[PDB]
Ligand binder design. Structure first.
Ligand SMILES: C[C@H](Nc1ccc2ncc3c(c2c1)CCOC3)C(=O)Nc1ccc(Cl)nc1
Ligand SMILES: C[C@H](Nc1ccc2ncc3c(c2c1)CCOC3)C(=O)Nc1ccc(Cl)nc1
Ligand SMILES: C[C@H](Nc1ccc2ncc3c(c2c1)CCOC3)C(=O)Nc1ccc(Cl)nc1
Ligand SMILES: C[C@H](Nc1ccc2ncc3c(c2c1)CCOC3)C(=O)Nc1ccc(Cl)nc1
Ligand SMILES: O=c1[nH]cnc2c1ncn2[C@@H]1O[C@H](COP(=O)(O)O)[C@@H](O)[C@H]1O
Ligand SMILES: O=c1[nH]cnc2c1ncn2[C@@H]1O[C@H](COP(=O)(O)O)[C@@H](O)[C@H]1O
Ligand SMILES: O=c1[nH]cnc2c1ncn2[C@@H]1O[C@H](COP(=O)(O)O)[C@@H](O)[C@H]1O
Ligand SMILES: O=c1[nH]cnc2c1ncn2[C@@H]1O[C@H](COP(=O)(O)O)[C@@H](O)[C@H]1O
Lengths: 326, 326, 326, 326
């Protein structure tokens, strides 16, 4: 008999249900606990990607109430410098930085803690790997107060493994990324709505938040990820092509573009077979207007669902399952 | 566990079942109770939109046996004048007018009642909001005999809330509109067939009719909405581009067009993020031929289902659920 | 609660299961009982349409082992002449002719019986209509030995109604036609695989065969309709554009075409709203090669399923349900 | 009632679940038992097709750790020569050869055994046919030690029939081929994921491996077929257009192509109606790079699922069912 664990749902499979409301979109509270000690003003994390987050983007997002994650596709010294630029800014801004879950990263982590990183991201393509769990147990034992986000997982067992290893927050997402080809290359993936709810259910009562990472295309996807139980979302494509993102603006035929590629793409990699594509994204302009539009969508959802806080959206809002016709 | 209330169906998910019939399409009775006191000759209401209903369209539809709803995107004096033009016509024509569910609308409602409005439409994007319920309770207490339609809702709880608040009829539709982007922007919506049946079930035995508002593309959709339990349907796109609708006819490249936009579009709005698009619809001609074609479709359905009246269609006709292949 | 009688399946929703076989495709017996007295060599009936069957096509199909149905879109005298041409041919060929189920058709039926019609087709768009049932009871009482096919129905109740009224065979199909718009216009229809199995189950033990009429696109659809329980299939589009079909061959831009339209199209009609489209079909050539190809497909199915006769295919062959991905 | 045996799933209907892993993709063991006596280094078999496998391709694939199957669309002497070329190469390479399951093939089989064939492929379009079963029982009685692969089947009953007839391995696949039209022509087919799991369940405890033949488009499909229980996969389109495949390279408009057609196509056939198409595939280059890419995908899956061997992937890895939206 075919070993089918369950049916799994993606963003497009569901819709949120309107409910009794005393919530006006302008009155909605978007603050969220990224960890027990770290509270963000908006539930937005920028992707730890070489075409998405460096100090400039991390500064703009922190100013909006979110948090950026400096990618690991650079030298230890460059990364420590990027973190220092964000920490020494003005309005006491928070920053995160990504590290590989393999051997020979103890030095990179040391430099990042010295530079004043608020949250270390152990950036793995498979968080349920034993090597990853051991490295986070080792980072936790060395730095007992350091806020650590571990990922990625897409199951209840994977979420429990990261929480037991010492993670302050667990990142969910195996295969949902806009630039991901893991589903086609390996045949592995878990539809994000189910992946998030499974991870959140596993971590209930622990106070360990879940980050929904990947596949957010519209502000409606943010709302769905949060009502599935995520405390925050991580976005790549949504912030790619913004003025603040790294890389130069290109001109194809009148229209402005920026590069956007998976960290598992042939380009980002230069041994594993690629699990990401290399693409051009239309220039989005200033990050501030993107955040205002996306958070506005979330605000209107909160009004329609009668959830005045991120915690209410996470625990009260209901879904309906829809067909391909829906 | 993911909080999935139920699976929800849209027009395309179902088909009506042919049954024993003594009904000829030409013998079918299309009359319906919009409220306990108001009976329409056809189950058609025109959308309270600035690109759909003003006095001219409200006059043509009333003549066909339906009812128009003058939009709120104008001055109190202009709206009172539009209603007066319809009431003082010839064959004792009925009219409705839309009002916002916010504060500072008591004056607009006063002018509309004075002008002779037959039915006041409390036009909300979220009828289950406390503010809306309170304003309709206040309008009901001030005007105890005034026919009031309240909306929009898409749940059993929402329908009961509007009926208890004093509504003479309840309007259903959260996200089904042809020009709606609420599903993408907020992630909120309820597939219309389920939304209608849920609202009708909640109001059974109260004599409060349900209006199916939004997503009607074909005459088959009208039949489906009515068999789901709606007493009448409200149409926007179906009447957009008619000669009687407001705005001027445009010429793009040989072909004639009219503007059609959501009331939550950037244009109609000029603070909330837009929940509607701005578009061009092909010129449809005289409203009379559109009504004849659409009601003819409904008539043939009544013949195929053996339902001689709107009430029989609402309570006897059965559906089959179909797949994406169907 | 939404009145959903059941889920209903179409051809594309299912696949036939390969089984143990001693059947070679060349050894397969395609003969079938159209009625208790009439046996066809192939399970093919041509559609009673003005762009499909007249004496020439009825002659070619009868020669292949099937039966044609002369359409009613002509004078009583022309129709009687068409039937005479087929009956007085060479190898003792069988013919059918279509009549409307309304009043003022007694005369048309009289002329057709005189001309030597083997099977009268009471051609209704809604066979479950009381008027239709009464007219077939009247034809049965007048002509007790005349083979009568009544249709169309798409339910168990509809099949029983036609069988009780006196039908020698029942025709199934409400909305499946390639040129049908009833599903969009009226919202009524039943996916054909379910419609056929329901009608066959209702008629079990009566010896009244079921004809699957409409939506056959490929030879695989013929096999599916028969395994659903149909004794034969009726085809319109599959035979449209053949040399033998009525009308002239048109030249658009190098390529040859023939007209194909629904009997409920604006053209065929020239009062009801249209339920059919008017189109051009590519010229198919001689009917003989079409039949050889389509019956060859059926033969290979019989080999794969191990069903040596039409009766075995109807009662032994199994299906699997597939998804949109399948 | 419609005779629906069950719902059946294809590759696109499912995804593999990530699990706890101590497996690095580079450490994964790809070896598999094609039969009790034959062990391959990679789970890849090339299709016995005239546009896919001849001695050159069979040599390249064997060198990669797989096995080729020389097609039967040639003379007995040519086929015996092709097998001799592979057997007499260098690093003791294994080869297979295809034979028809009809009468007058005893001579072809005799020549192939003499030439040193390691595995005889009884290549039938319907393995559950009595003729096929009898011919393999006869080959088994004549050659008691000869490794025989019999196919194709897509049911538990079909797998048991081939195993009881003497097959050393059973090949699964009715209708999944990229170039197959059997589903459209005959209406017969079984979605491959279900077909494989059903055949594997039927053969549990017998030590008779199952080959998943047809529809493999991506390396993710290989992983899915193996986790469904297949010990190996057979590929046609994946190896078509490689330098090693038969036929000449064509130039259409700057781009290089090779022919790829079904063995049931009009061309390969030159009596049955065609069940295959004739097409052009883009030139893929050297087989070595294709294998490296595809096996790399499989390796990454093994890392993500924590399955270090083909046997672990076959018996431990779990799936989730996904929607059309997934
Ligand atoms: C080549 C591939 N590159 C990346 C890079 C960044 C990623 N970031 C997030 C995610 C994925 C990513 C894949 C894939 C799964 O979904 C989330 C990768 O590392 N493959 C991989 C497979 C199996 C194992 Cl044991 N180890 C590694
Ligand atoms: C911007 C948006 N504009 C409109 C205007 C007309 C509408 N008319 C009907 C419907 C919708 C409409 C949206 C949306 C839901 O489906 C039916 C709107 O008002 N958003 C909104 C969201 C949450 C809350 Cl608490 N308050 C208001
Ligand atoms: C206009 C329409 N014209 C046709 C003509 C031929 C047909 N032939 C087969 C079928 C249909 C056909 C419709 C429609 C249903 O599916 C099978 C028709 O007569 N409508 C109709 C509707 C309700 C009632 Cl009481 N009476 C008649
Ligand atoms: C014409 C057709 N030609 C082929 C050739 C190679 C194939 N190879 C694999 C498969 C199929 C193939 C069909 C079809 C089923 O799926 C797998 C074929 O032989 N039809 C057929 C049908 C019924 C019976 Cl009793 N005998 C034979
Ligand atoms: O090459 C890759 N393959 C798979 N996932 C990737 C790759 N690069 C980044 N990701 C993931 O995709 C996310 C971005 O998803 P997006 O917001 O849908 O574009 C990142 O935060 C990572 O979790
Ligand atoms: O901007 C908008 N967003 C969402 N719904 C809207 C908007 N404007 C109007 N509507 C709804 O859409 C209906 C028209 O739907 P239609 O008939 O499908 O075009 C109206 O009667 C309103 O209920
Ligand atoms: O205008 C029409 N509307 C609906 N059904 C029609 C019409 N004309 C013919 N039909 C049906 O469609 C069948 C032909 O279906 P086809 O083989 O899919 O083209 C006929 O035999 C009739 O039952
Ligand atoms: O004409 C044909 N019809 C149906 N199946 C075929 C035909 N020729 C080959 N096959 C099957 O299709 C497989 C190739 O599938 P692919 O890898 O998806 O291209 C072969 O190994 C055969 O089992």
């Amino acid at each position: 008999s075919l070993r089918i664990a369950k049916e799994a749902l993606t963003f497009d499979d569901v819709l949120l249900v309107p409910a009794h409301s005393t919530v006006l979109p302008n009155t909605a509270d978007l603050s969220t606990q990224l960890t027990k000690t770290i509270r963000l003003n908006i539930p937005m994390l920028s992707a730890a990607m070489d075409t998405v987050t460096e100090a400039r983007l991390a500064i703009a997002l922190a100013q909006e109430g979110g948090i950026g994650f400096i990618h690991k596709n650079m030298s230890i010294e460059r990364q420590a410098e990027e973190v220092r630029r964000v920490k020494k800014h003005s309005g006491g801004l928070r920053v995160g930085a990504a590290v590989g879950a393999g051997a020979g990263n103890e030095e990179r982590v040391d430099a990042l803690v010295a530079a004043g990183v608020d949250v270390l991201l152990i950036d793995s393509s498979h968080g349920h790997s034993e090597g990853v769990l051991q490295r986070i147990r080792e980072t936790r034992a060395k730095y007992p107060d350091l806020q650590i986000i571990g990922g990625n997982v897409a199951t209840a067992a994977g979420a429990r493994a990261l929480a037991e290893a010492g993670c302050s927050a667990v990142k969910v997402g195996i295969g949902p990324g806009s630039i991901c080809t893991t589903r086609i290359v390996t045949g592995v993936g878990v539809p994000q709505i189910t992946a998030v709810a499974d991870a959140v259910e596993a971590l209930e009562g622990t106070g360990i938040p879940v980050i929904a990472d990947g596949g957010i295309r519209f502000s409606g996807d943010i709302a769905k990820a949060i009502a599935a139980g995520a405390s925050a979302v991580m976005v790549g494509s949504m912030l790619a092509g913004t003025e603040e993102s790294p890389g130069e603006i290109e001109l194809y035929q009148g229209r402005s573009y920026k590069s956007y590629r998976g960290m598992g793409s042939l380009g980002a990699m230069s041994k594993l077979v690629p699990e990401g594509i290399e693409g051009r994204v239309a220039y989005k302009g200033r990050l501030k207007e993107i955040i205002h539009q996306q958070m506005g969508g979330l605000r209107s959802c909160m009004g329609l669902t009668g959830c005045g806080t991120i915690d209410e959206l996470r625990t009260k809002a209901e879904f309906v399952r829809i067909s391909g016709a829906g």
